[PDB]
Amino acid sequence: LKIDVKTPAGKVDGAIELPAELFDVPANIALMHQVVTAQRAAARQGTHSTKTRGEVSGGGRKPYRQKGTGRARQGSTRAPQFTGGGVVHGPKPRDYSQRTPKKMIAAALRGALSDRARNGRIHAITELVEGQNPSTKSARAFLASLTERKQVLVVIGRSDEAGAKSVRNLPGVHILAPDQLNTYDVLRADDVVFSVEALNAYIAANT
Amino acid sequence: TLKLHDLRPARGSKIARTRVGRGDGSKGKTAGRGTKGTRARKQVPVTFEGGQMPIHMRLPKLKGFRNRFRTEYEIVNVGDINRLFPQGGAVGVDDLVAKGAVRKNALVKVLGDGKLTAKVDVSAHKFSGSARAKITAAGGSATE
Amino acid sequence: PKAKTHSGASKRFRRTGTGKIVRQKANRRHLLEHKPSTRTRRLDGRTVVAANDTKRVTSLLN
Amino acid sequence: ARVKRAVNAHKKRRSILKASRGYRGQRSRLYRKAKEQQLHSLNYAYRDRRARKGEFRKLWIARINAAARLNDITYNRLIQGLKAAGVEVDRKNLADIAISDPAAFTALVDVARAALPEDVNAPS
RNA sequence: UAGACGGUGAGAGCCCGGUACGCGAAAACCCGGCACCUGCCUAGUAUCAAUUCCCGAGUAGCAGCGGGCCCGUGGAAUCCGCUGUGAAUCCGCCGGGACCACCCGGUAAGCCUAAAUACUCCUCGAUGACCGAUAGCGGAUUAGUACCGUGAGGGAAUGGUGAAAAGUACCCCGGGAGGGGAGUGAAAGAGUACCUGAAACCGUGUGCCUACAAUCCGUCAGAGCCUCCUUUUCCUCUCCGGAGGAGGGUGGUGAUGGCGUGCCUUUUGAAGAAUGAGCCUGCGAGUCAGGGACAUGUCGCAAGGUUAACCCGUGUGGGGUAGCCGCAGCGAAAGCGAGUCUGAAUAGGGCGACCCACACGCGCAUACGCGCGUGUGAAUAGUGGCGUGUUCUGGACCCGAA
RNA sequence: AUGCCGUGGUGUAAAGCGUGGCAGUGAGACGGCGGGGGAUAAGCUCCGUACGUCGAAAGGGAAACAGCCCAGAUCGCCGGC
RNA sequence: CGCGGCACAUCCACCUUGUGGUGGGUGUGGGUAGGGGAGCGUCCCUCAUUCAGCGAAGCCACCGGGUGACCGGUGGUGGA
Ligand SMILES: [Mg+2]
Ligand SMILES: [Mg+2]
Ligand SMILES: [Mg+2]
Ligand SMILES: [Mg+2]
Ligand SMILES: [Mg+2]
Ligand SMILES: [Mg+2]
Ligand SMILES: [Mg+2]
Ligand SMILES: [Mg+2]
Ligand SMILES: [Mg+2]
Ligand SMILES: [Mg+2]
Ligand SMILES: [Mg+2]
Ligand SMILES: [Mg+2]
Ligand SMILES: [Mg+2]
Ligand SMILES: [Mg+2]
Ligand SMILES: [Mg+2]
Ligand SMILES: [Mg+2]
Ligand SMILES: [Mg+2]
Ligand SMILES: [Mg+2]
Ligand SMILES: [Mg+2]
Ligand SMILES: [Mg+2]
Ligand SMILES: [Mg+2]
Ligand SMILES: [Mg+2]
Ligand SMILES: [Mg+2]
Ligand SMILES: [Mg+2]
Ligand SMILES: [Mg+2]
Ligand SMILES: [Mg+2]
Ligand SMILES: [Mg+2]
Ligand SMILES: [Mg+2]
Ligand SMILES: [Mg+2]
Ligand SMILES: [Mg+2]
Ligand SMILES: [Mg+2]
Ligand SMILES: [Mg+2]
Ligand SMILES: [Mg+2]
Ligand SMILES: [Mg+2]
Ligand SMILES: [Mg+2]
Ligand SMILES: [Mg+2]
Ligand SMILES: [Mg+2]
Ligand SMILES: [Mg+2]
Ligand SMILES: [Mg+2]
Ligand SMILES: [Mg+2]
Ligand SMILES: [Mg+2]
Ligand SMILES: [Mg+2]
Ligand SMILES: [Mg+2]
Ligand SMILES: [Mg+2]
Ligand SMILES: [Mg+2]
Ligand SMILES: [Mg+2]
Ligand SMILES: [Mg+2]
Ligand SMILES: [Mg+2]
Ligand SMILES: [Mg+2]
Ligand SMILES: [Mg+2]
Ligand SMILES: [Mg+2]
Ligand SMILES: [Mg+2]
Ligand SMILES: [Mg+2]
Ligand SMILES: [Mg+2]
Ligand SMILES: [Mg+2]
Ligand SMILES: [Mg+2]
Ligand SMILES: [Mg+2]
Ligand SMILES: [Mg+2]
Ligand SMILES: [Mg+2]
Ligand SMILES: [Mg+2]
Ligand SMILES: [Mg+2]
Ligand SMILES: [Mg+2]
Ligand SMILES: [Mg+2]
Incomplete structure (x- = not known):
């Protein structure tokens, strides 16, 4: 319900309140199995x-x-x-994309993010590297202060490039934009790490 | 936490496909056909009744013509007005589209099925004869 | 593609409000002098398509 | 996914050919001919498990009849005599006493002969 | 900012080629700027007049015969060809589905025109719930080659030693081929007939059975023999050893007794002397498309449900209301509408709506329930996904003519 | 005489009926009883039969022997009737 | 008929009193065309986990297991 924001090489500056109609939604497993299947079906290439x-x-x-x-x-x-x-x-040659409705896609994404928020798996940071040039070494040590787990979804804004470059070749770290969140990459991850600008853009796009 | 190996479909949703012609413990050699005639290798058309005059040629055609210039109305009942607008007031065609009583982009027509007890004041096309009665007897008016 | 309906059967059958399929009746177009008015009144109007024809007629209309 | 057939298909071929060891000719060597014969061999075996219940009874009755005629009675009136005297020993053991202990079989004939009616040809 | 991919004597971000990221061009080509240069324009404008002239000709129109339009010659407009006939310049002419009138719209018989769309022999860079040597291109190999045909044409088969060739010096038998010993190698249980090395098929050795018996070749009963493990005293050398026999138990074999008419296909009925199959290995038959159709399981939303093309994104994400289905039916239709068609009918009938399971009550009826409020808060609904069955259109389960 | 239709009792789980999904079948065979055709021949041919078995039914009997007589095989037993 | 195993329908009892489970009666369980239900084995992908040059696959043999398709163990061969 309330996530404290931490800083690279520092302490808690502020907090974000997660809205309960977006992060406290009861998880439908039969709905999430259909959405996750439909994404890996659209992921195919079908060149056989x-x-x-x-x-x-x-x-x-x-x-x-x-x-x-x-x-x-x-x-x-x-x-x-x-x-x-x-x-x-x-x-x-086939195409395997399906026609999953919009309300079913958005409800599975909320149900997966609600399950991470219910278990303390949502983390808010201000930025990854505290400068302007990228550094995988400083950005790896900061994620280790958050997590001890193998799969980490870093959700940071597309304009921020030094943070994205800093966590590219880390194994078990997936990067995506705030308007590209989906059920497969959130259920694969153990810890979802939002930026403070990225989490505010997801909430404001869904009120 | 829920992971990708905790997701499974609802019970009864995914059922198994029938693979036909795969041995004697399932649908065996002939795959459900059995015959030696037409149905063993081909489809029989639906229009064909073995050679006699079929049902779609024995019977006469339905009488009449279609009106090319037929105007069609989208129908709202005055009992639905009483449930949708329990405070009365002005009721337009735009006010019925937003309330879901009627489709977009079409001429509306008030009919008189139900009980109108509110004081509404409704503009539409082509009021019914029993709908003009119930609107004024509830205290309102009905204009074109 | 897309399923084409049957043109000759859609000129002969239609549906009521509940979903019954109705037809008209034969022996009525001509040769009407030796038929008494008890017979042409029997053959007048519409009747519902019988239960043993309703599976093939429904597939011609679809 | 193109699937080769051999890892699956050889599973039933090895088991048919092991059940046919000791057959002569093509019936122990070739899978198509070993399998035609396994159909008959398991029908013959089914047929003969239900037949040997009557075959052993046919062996026992033959030995009870041989031992009874040594003790001047037929098999016929011996079975009437043991039903009349209430001796519920079955024919499996009555043909086993007749070999290993002929004195006790003579002691069973005297029980059967005594319980038999005085005129067996008279009506009941 | 590099954990892409491949190599390297076995799973390498730190050994190699690279990768992220950056740097680079004599000349030729391409693209663009600025110049040269090349063209164009500097006399019309405005008002009023209806007096005239002009506004694409063997054309439009008309007719005959045809072609094409949803429109198969029809009442047949609009569009194109061939044959005849053949106008008019604005008060003109053509179209608005025969045609006429009024009205609206547009100016045929001159020309040119970018972008949005289609395609890939070829170049470059990637990718795969694609193939892995009977597969995948016919072609991983002399491949459109060898070969077949006069010809047009048709059209194969053939990959793998090892990390490294260190490919077995030397000696022996032999004319050689082939081997044996040595030696190399982690391994020749990898020796250019070479990774792994299945089955059919072919030998050699050994246990049991078989030369007086009529056998769909098996099955159940069952003696003996052979083999290898174990229970009780004995060779008690006794920790031994099991040394031999007795009992049991595996494994092999089967003298002898009974029972016993192959498999498939197709038939009223086949062991059938009806059909197909010499054998083994490999391959060889209900698939796919589509907001299709009907019916169902299941999930989401719900009097609503849902987008299509498209747009934006690194993707499976976000937009996108056009549309479709549900929302009231009846009628040939005009139409009217909880009704409506037929009918002279306030007759009946068709089709379609329509709750009493129920509290109070209203003239009440033996208590019953006809009618209406507040519900006592009656019991229903669609639509989009994804399964599955059938189905439609396609080669549509596969093979096969003349 | 049977059969058929109705009705009242009594009996009897896997009867009947309505409406949907998916079928297959539409070459029958012999035996009993009734009849036609044929010569009151046929392992003939055509009908009837809340008749039977085979088809699609193994097991026991009829020497052998789809259709006859007995009996309907969930599996095991070296039990019994 | 007797004794023992399995399966299906129905009934009676209960444990969230049918999404089901357990227990106890009775009945049933030949089967071609065909209909319905529930499973075995091969391969590829994703997530999780666990083996492997101290020997993967594939193959061969022996010993065992399951109601069936089939499975497991151990050994020999072999080289990812
Ligand atoms: Mg979308
Ligand atoms: Mg499919
Ligand atoms: Mg077959
Ligand atoms: Mg066939
Ligand atoms: Mg058929
Ligand atoms: Mg005819
Ligand atoms: Mg007429
Ligand atoms: Mg008349
Ligand atoms: Mg033998
Ligand atoms: Mg018996
Ligand atoms: Mg690598
Ligand atoms: Mg390098
Ligand atoms: Mg002009
Ligand atoms: Mg003309
Ligand atoms: Mg034409
Ligand atoms: Mg001309
Ligand atoms: Mg007109
Ligand atoms: Mg012009
Ligand atoms: Mg042009
Ligand atoms: Mg263009
Ligand atoms: Mg291109
Ligand atoms: Mg290329
Ligand atoms: Mg090839
Ligand atoms: Mg090929
Ligand atoms: Mg030549
Ligand atoms: Mg040598
Ligand atoms: Mg050597
Ligand atoms: Mg060496
Ligand atoms: Mg080796
Ligand atoms: Mg070789
Ligand atoms: Mg080899
Ligand atoms: Mg002899
Ligand atoms: Mg003989
Ligand atoms: Mg015949
Ligand atoms: Mg048949
Ligand atoms: Mg034959
Ligand atoms: Mg023969
Ligand atoms: Mg032959
Ligand atoms: Mg209508
Ligand atoms: Mg009426
Ligand atoms: Mg629903
Ligand atoms: Mg061709
Ligand atoms: Mg051909
Ligand atoms: Mg039915
Ligand atoms: Mg017939
Ligand atoms: Mg036939
Ligand atoms: Mg007949
Ligand atoms: Mg007769
Ligand atoms: Mg006959
Ligand atoms: Mg008869
Ligand atoms: Mg029989
Ligand atoms: Mg029967
Ligand atoms: Mg018999
Ligand atoms: Mg016999
Ligand atoms: Mg007896
Ligand atoms: Mg039975
Ligand atoms: Mg059965
Ligand atoms: Mg069947
Ligand atoms: Mg070893
Ligand atoms: Mg494999
Ligand atoms: Mg095995
Ligand atoms: Mg092993
Ligand atoms: Mg192995």
Whole structure:
């Protein structure tokens, strides 16, 4: 309900009040399983392909006369029972995106962020590096003062570039913009670390 | 905390697909067809009744014509006015769209089903004959 | 694609307010001199499509 | 995902061929012919587990009948005599006493012969 | 600011090529600026007049025959061709679905025109709940090659030693091939016939059975023999050893007795002398698209539900009300509307709405419940996702003609 | 005589009915009893039968033997009727 | 019929008194076309976790387990 804001190399300056209609929502698991499935279904590429019997090279003529040879009648050399023939019902390029409604997408995101806020997993900071040039060493030590856990979602504003560069190649740290929060990256994370500008922009976009 | 390995669908939502033609312990060789005739390799069209004159040619056509220039109204009942506006006042076409009684961009028409007990003052198109009665008998007016 | 409805069946069947499917009745267009008025009044109007035809007629209308 | 078939398909092939060890010809060597014979072998086995309950009874009755005729009675009136005397020993053990202890089988005939009615041909 | 990816003697951010990030161009090409240079313009304007002239010609229109429009010649407009006939310059002409009148709209028979859209032989940079050598391109290999055909054409098969070639010096048998010993290597249980090395199939050795018996070749009953472990005194060398026998137990085999008509397909009925199958290994058949259709499971919102193209973002995120479905029906329709069509009907019938399970009460009815308020607070509803079944249109489960 | 329709009792779980989803089948065979065609022949052919079995039914009997007689196999037992 | 195991329907009891579970009766459980229900094995991806040059896969053999598809252990071979 109330998150104290900490500073890089320092102490608590202020606090943010999380609104209860956005961070204290009861979590629907059947709803979150549908949204997380639909995002990984949209994440696919679907570039898998085979050839049918009409698309394998050659195979136009009838290879011998139908009656009088003592062989089974065949009709084409690229039938699917042959070696080198076309695939029957094989893969073709598909798109797997789904049509999950807007209210179901927004409710799963609130239900995942409510579960982190209910467990003390939301952290508010002012910035990652306290200067203007990036430094992974100083930014790693500051996240270790917050967390001891392997998966960390850092939500910082897109204009802030020195903070984003400072936590890029840290393993187990995912960066995204405040208007790109979704259910998969929040349920993968153990600790969601907002910036003070990033958390105020998420609340103001949802009142 | 809920993690990605704690999510599972609602019971009964995801059911298994029937894979047909995969041995004798399931739907076996013929995959539910059984026959040796048309239904064993092809579909039969719905319009075909074996050769006699079908139901969509035995019967006569429905009589009449469609009016090309037919105007259509979106309908609101005066009993719905009593529930939507329990204080009375002016009721326009824009006031009925926001209250969900009627669709956008269409001519409205008040009908007289229900009990109007409030003092409303409603502007619309084409009042019903029993709707002009109940509006004035409740204390209001109805103009075009 | 998109399912095309059946043109000849939509000229012969329609739906009521509750969802019944109604039709008109045959033996009425011509040869009407030897038919008494007890018969043309029986063949007048509309009746509901019988239960043994309602599955195939509903799929022609859809 | 293209799936090769062999890791799954060889599972039932190895087990059919182990159940057919000791068959002669193609019936221990080839999977298609070992499997036709396992269909008959497990029907024959089912058929014979229910048949040997009658086969052993057919063996026991033959030995009770042989031992009773040594003690000048038939199998026929011996079974009437033991039902009349209330001796509920079954034919499995009555053909086992007849071999290992012939004196006790003579003591059972005298119980069966005494309980038998005076004229067996007279009506009940 | 680098934990991309690959290499390196086995899972490397710190060993190598790189990566993040930055730096770089003689000349040619491309793009742009500024100059040269090249063109264009500097006399019209305004008011009034209706007197005249002009406003795209073998054209429009008309007719015959055709083509195409939702429109298959129809009452057939608008648009195009061929044949005949053939105007008018604004009071003109053409269109507004035969046609006429009024009215509205526009000025055919001259020309040019960017962007929004389509495509990828090819270049560069990436990517995959794509393939991994019968797959994936026909082509990882002489590949459109070898080969087949007079020709147009058709059209294959063929990858892997090891980290390193250190690819076995030397000796022996042999004409060689091949081997044996040595030696190399972590391993030749990796030796250019080379990673792993399955089955069919082919030998050699060994245990049991079999040369007087009629066998869908198995199954149940069952003796003996062979093998390897164990219970009771004995060889008690006794910790030994199990040394031999007796009992039990595995594993192999099966003298002998009974029972016993292959599998598939297709049929009234097949062991059938009906069909298919020599054998093994590998491959070979209900799939996919779509805000489709009907029905259901399930989730979200709910008298509402939901967006499409599109827009913005590193993405699966946020916008986007056009639309669709629900919201009142009845009627050929005009129409009227909890009703409405038919009808002369205040007749009946069709279709459609319509609660008594109930407190008080109102003229009340044996107590019953007809009508209406406050509910006693009656019992319902749609729509968008995702499963699944059927289905429509597509090759539509797969193979097969003449 | 049976059969058929109605009704009142009594009995009887897996009867009946309405409306949806998905079917398959629409070549039958012999046996009993009644009839047609045929020569009152056919392992003939065509109908009737709250008749039966096979089809799709293993087990026991009929020497063998889909359709006849007995009996309907959840599995195990070296029990009994 | 007897004794023992399993399954399904129904009834009777209860434990959040059907989303179900446990217990006790009675009944039922041949089956082609076909309908409904519930599962085994192969492969790929995601999250979590755990093995592996002190030997992964694959293969071979022996010993065992399950109501079925099938599984597990141990050893030999082998090299990720
Ligand atoms: Mg072709
Ligand atoms: Mg062909
Ligand atoms: Mg291919
Ligand atoms: Mg969206
Ligand atoms: Mg699917
Ligand atoms: Mg088959
Ligand atoms: Mg078939
Ligand atoms: Mg059929
Ligand atoms: Mg005809
Ligand atoms: Mg008429
Ligand atoms: Mg008349
Ligand atoms: Mg043998
Ligand atoms: Mg018996
Ligand atoms: Mg790497
Ligand atoms: Mg480097
Ligand atoms: Mg002009
Ligand atoms: Mg013309
Ligand atoms: Mg035309
Ligand atoms: Mg001309
Ligand atoms: Mg007009
Ligand atoms: Mg012009
Ligand atoms: Mg042009
Ligand atoms: Mg253009
Ligand atoms: Mg391009
Ligand atoms: Mg490329
Ligand atoms: Mg190839
Ligand atoms: Mg040549
Ligand atoms: Mg040598
Ligand atoms: Mg050597
Ligand atoms: Mg060495
Ligand atoms: Mg090795
Ligand atoms: Mg070799
Ligand atoms: Mg090898
Ligand atoms: Mg002999
Ligand atoms: Mg004989
Ligand atoms: Mg025949
Ligand atoms: Mg049949
Ligand atoms: Mg044959
Ligand atoms: Mg034969
Ligand atoms: Mg043959
Ligand atoms: Mg209507
Ligand atoms: Mg009426
Ligand atoms: Mg719903
Ligand atoms: Mg039904
Ligand atoms: Mg017939
Ligand atoms: Mg047939
Ligand atoms: Mg018949
Ligand atoms: Mg007869
Ligand atoms: Mg006959
Ligand atoms: Mg008969
Ligand atoms: Mg039988
Ligand atoms: Mg039966
Ligand atoms: Mg029999
Ligand atoms: Mg017999
Ligand atoms: Mg008896
Ligand atoms: Mg039974
Ligand atoms: Mg059954
Ligand atoms: Mg079946
Ligand atoms: Mg080893
Ligand atoms: Mg694998
Ligand atoms: Mg195994
Ligand atoms: Mg192992
Ligand atoms: Mg192994």
